[PDB]
From a paper:
The virus recognizes the host cell by attaching its Spike (S) receptor-binding domain (RBD) to the host receptor, ACE2. Here, we report the isolation and biological and structural characterization of a single-chain antibody (nanobody) from RBD-immunized alpaca. The nanobody, named DL28, binds to RBD tightly with a KD of 1.56 nM and neutralizes the original SARS-CoV-2 strain with an IC50 of 0.41 μg mL−1. Competition binding assays show that DL28 blocks ACE2-binding.
Numbering used by the authors:
A (entry chain C): 1 to 114
B (entry chain A): 334 to 529
């Protein structure tokens, strides 16, 4: 079956940085859709940054702060999370969609203090 | 031996409608009788073929299309429907010969405080072609001003969560849907029932 390796996260000071990664194995990830969604507690899960094959795409509050990259060679998507604010505290889940299914990560907690 | 119906109906993972799963079923024998009779399935409606006459018939290809939608939206899995699921997520053809099977899965596909794993596409520039699958995530331009990859005023992210809670009423509950797609060509037949 298909698995996803979430790595990164933890506590940071406000203004700190982080980098999340999510590496994909178990399928063909040619032209696939990879990126991150976040869920602050009691709120709906909302998207953060995502690359489908046509376009990459960013949430409103993270433009200029967060950057999404992938190398197709290692089947890994990266999220460089700069300029972190205590609003950004959420569980961050990577999303990978191949030709057959959408898959989710287990979630890495990211917490920002003031 | 028999066609693998365990693998499609009792699958561990069911996909979101925008990212629906197509398993191809060929070169085997299929008893549809046990499926039609089962009261597990609330919806079992067939288009252009009788449910009685399933084991008699012979088809060139049979496809199993499976996804999770809202309970209201099961209406849209029919030929010639319109709505957010039929226009932007999963489209049947006008000449669709085949069967739509669905059942409630509130107990598996909802958790407390919402299941945000299942999504649906809310906007697209065109309606989908039949059996077309869109997993694009570009920001939808709803206005005159271009989007620059950012969720903005008239710039919207196309995938919306169902967020299934168990406290939702039956219309807003998770239903698993399997679509059996019988294709007939001038090609030779691959899948017949037990009686042929
Ligand atoms: C889809 O799933 C239902 C549920 O069955 C479960 O998942 C299957 C893949 C198997 O792993 C099952 O062992 C598991 O329970 C299947 O229907 C069910 O079939 C089983 C037998 O395989 C039935 O068990 C029996 O129950 C009767 C009385 O209840 C006993 O007398 C028998 O000795 C035996 O224990 C089970 O009740 C039945 N459930 C329903 C809802 O009818 C189904 O076969 C499967 N679909 C396919 C095509 O595989």
């Amino acid at each position: 079956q298909v698995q996803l390796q979430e790595s990164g996260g933890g506590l940071v000071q406000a203004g700190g940085s982080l980098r999340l990664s999510c590496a994909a194995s178990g399928s063909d990830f040619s032209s696939s859709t990879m990126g991150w969604y976040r869920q602050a507690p009691g709120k709906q899960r909302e998207f953060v940054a995502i690359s489908s094959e046509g376009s990459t795409s960013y949430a409103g509050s993270v433009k200029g702060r967060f950057t999404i990259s992938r190398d197709n060679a290692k089947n890994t998507v990266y999220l460089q999370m700069n300029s972190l604010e205590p609003e950004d505290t959420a569980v961050y889940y990577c999303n990978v969609v191949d030709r057959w299914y959408d898959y989710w990560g287990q979630g890495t907690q990211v917490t920002v203090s003031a | 031996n028999l066609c693998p119906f365990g693998e499609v109906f009792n699958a561990t993972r069911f996909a979101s409608v925008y990212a629906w799963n197509r398993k191809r079923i060929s070169n085997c024998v299929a008893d549809y009788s046990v499926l039609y009779n089962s009261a597990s399935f609330s919806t079992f409606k067939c288009y252009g073929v009788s449910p009685t006459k399933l084991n008699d018939l012979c088809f060139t290809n049979v496809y199993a299309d499976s996804f999770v939608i809202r309970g209201d939206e099961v209406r849209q899995i029919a030929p010639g429907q319109t709505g957010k699921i039929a226009d932007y997520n999963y489209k049947l053809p006008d000449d669709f010969t085949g069967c739509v099977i669905a059942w409630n899965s509130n107990n598996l596909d909802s958790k407390v405080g919402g299941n945000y794993n299942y999504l649906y596409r809310l906007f697209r520039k065109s309606n989908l072609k039949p059996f077309e699958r869109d997993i694009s995530t570009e920001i939808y331009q709803a206005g005159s001003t271009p989007c620059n990859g950012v969720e903005g005023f008239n710039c919207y992210f196309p995938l919306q969560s169902y967020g299934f809670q168990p406290t939702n009423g039956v219309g807003y509950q998770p239903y698993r849907v399997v679509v059996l797609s019988f294709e007939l060509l001038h090609a030779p037949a691959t899948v017949c029932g037990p009686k042929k």
